[PDB]
Amino acid sequence: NSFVGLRVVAKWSSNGYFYSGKITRDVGAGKYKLLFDDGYECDVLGKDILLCDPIPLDTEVTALSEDEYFSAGVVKGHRKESGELYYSIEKEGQRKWYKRMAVILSLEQGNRLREQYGLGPYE
Ligand SMILES: CN1CCN(c2ccccc2N)CC1
């Protein structure tokens, strides 16, 4: 019945980006323990957790291109046939697949989605 077990996209620690993870504990006072998909764990405030699973079509996101540089793109599709989520991300009229954990949100991109998808609460 609780928020535990939900897949989320959440601000990591006090960094500039939100990353994919899972809520593993309600630690009280509107904070949650998260297990991030890369294996790291931290406590995150509810205001900094997005509940959209998956991130929806036409969302502006960030991803690594060519194993070289991070830049923005737009979500244009999803694949979950294998039981693992992949996103189709469009950059400059061209699309490429990205595993769930490779799609991240800058503070601007993630804060944008609070009104629609934030855990919260928000006053
Ligand atoms: C979710 N996951 C947590 C660890 N992060 C990290 C790794 C190595 C250096 C800095 C940072 N922030 C990457 C994102």
So, CATH architecture of the largest domain?
A: Roll
Q: Categorize the overall geometry.
A: globular
How many beta-strand elements?
10
Q: Give me the secondary-structure category.
A: mainly beta
Report the CATH topology name of the largest domain: SH3 type barrels
Gyration radius, in Å: 14 Å
**Biggest β-sheet, characterized?**
6 strands, antiparallel
Cross-link (Glycyl lysine isopeptide (Lys-Gly) (interchain with G-Cter in SUMO1)): 80
Region (Interaction with dimethylated histone H4): 12-40
Organism: Homo sapiens (Human)
Region (Tudor-like): 1-120
How does the SSE layout of this entry go?
Blueprint: E1 7-11, E2 17-28, E3 31-36, E4 41-45, E5 49-50, E6 60-65, E7 69-79, E8 86-91, E9 94-99, E10 105-106, H1 107-112, H2 114-117
Antiparallel strand pairs: 1-2, 1-5, 2-3, 2-10, 3-4, 6-7, 7-8, 8-9
2-(4-methylpiperazin-1-yl)aniline (QSS) binds at residues 12, 15, 19, 36, 38, 40.
Protein name: TP53-binding protein 1
Region (Interaction with dimethylated histone H4): 12-40
Cross-link (Glycyl lysine isopeptide (Lys-Gly) (interchain with G-Cter in SUMO2)): 80
Q: What does this molecule look like?
A:
By secondary structure, the chain is mostly beta strands. It has helices at residues 107-112, 114-117; strands at residues 7-11, 17-28, 31-36, 41-45, 49-50, 60-65, 69-79, 86-91, 94-99, 105-106. It is 8% helix and 50% strand. It has two helices and ten strands; from the N terminus they run ββββββββββαα. The strands form two sheets. Strands 1, 2, 3, 4, 5 and 10 form a six-stranded antiparallel sheet that branches. The protein has two domains: 1-55, Roll (SH3 type barrels), CATH 2.30.30; 56-123, SH3 type barrels (Roll). Residues 12, 15, 19, 36, 38, 40 line the site of 2-(4-methylpiperazin-1-yl)aniline. The PDB classes it as transcription. The entry lists the keywords 53BP1, Structural Genomics, Structural Genomics Consortium, transcription. The assembly is monomeric. The entry is titled "Tudor Domain of Tumor suppressor p53BP1 with MFP-4184". The protein: TP53-binding protein 1.
